[PDB]
Amino acid sequence: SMLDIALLMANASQLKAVVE
Amino acid sequence: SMLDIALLMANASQLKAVVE
Amino acid sequence: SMLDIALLMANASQLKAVVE
Amino acid sequence: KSAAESMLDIALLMANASQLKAVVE
Amino acid sequence: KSAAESMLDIALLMANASQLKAVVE
Amino acid sequence: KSAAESMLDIALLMANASQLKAVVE
Amino acid sequence: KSAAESMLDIALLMANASQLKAVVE
Amino acid sequence: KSAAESMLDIALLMANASQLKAVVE
Amino acid sequence: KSAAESMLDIALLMANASQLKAVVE
Amino acid sequence: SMLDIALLMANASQLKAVVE
Amino acid sequence: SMLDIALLMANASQLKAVVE
Amino acid sequence: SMLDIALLMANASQLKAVVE
């Protein structure tokens, strides 16, 4: 007997600007 | 007996700007 | 006996701008 | 000039009603 | 000039009603 | 000039009603 | 028993770029 | 027993870029 | 027993960039 | 000159339960 | 000259339970 | 010249329970 309700959300934002 | 409701969401945004 | 309801969503946005 | 406008979304709606009646004599 | 405008979202709604009746004699 | 404006969100709503009735004689 | 489970959502995404160049000599 | 579970949401994302160049000689 | 569980939310994200260049000679 | 972007969204949920 | 961006959202939930 | 960005959100929940 087991009733897991495991549930996730996630975000991400990488930004590698090499502006001269 | 097991009743998992595993469920995810996800986002992502890579951005490698080499603006001169 | 098992009643998984595994289910996902996902997004993505790569952007490699080399604007001069 | 230039431009690049992206947009994108996801929706989800559910009414799951799982049910289990494991029985052993 | 330049520009790059991105936008993106996720929604989710649920009414899960899991139920278990494990019984052993 | 340049610009890079990103935006992104996630929503979630739930009404889980798990229930278990483990019984052993 | 009884039950009445309702759920409903709205999404919206925009990139409006209005622009006006009113000129009078 | 009885039950009445309601849920409802709204999302919105924008990148408005209004611009005006009123000029009079 | 009875029950009435309501839930509801609103999101909003913006990148407004209004701009005005009123000029009179 | 006018550039309205008027725009709406709306929800509603009436519920008149007379459960005895 | 005018650049309105008027825009709304709205929710509502009436509930008149007369449970006895 | 005018650049209004008027914009609203709103919620509501009436509940008139006459439970006996």
Curated annotation (Swiss-Prot), chains A, B, C, J, K, L:
Residue numbers marked as site, Cleavage: L7, L8
Residues covered by region (Required to induce plasma membrane rupture): 1-20
Glycan-carrying positions: N11
Region (Helix alpha2): 9-20
Induction: By nerve injury both in dorsal root ganglion neurons and in Schwann cells.
Source superkingdom: Eukaryota
Entry comment describing in which tissues the protein is expressed: Widely expressed in both adult and embryonic tissues, primarily those of epithelial origin.
Similarity comment text for this entry: Belongs to the ninjurin family.
Protein's name in the database: Ninjurin-1
Organism name: Homo sapiens
Gene coding for it: NINJ1
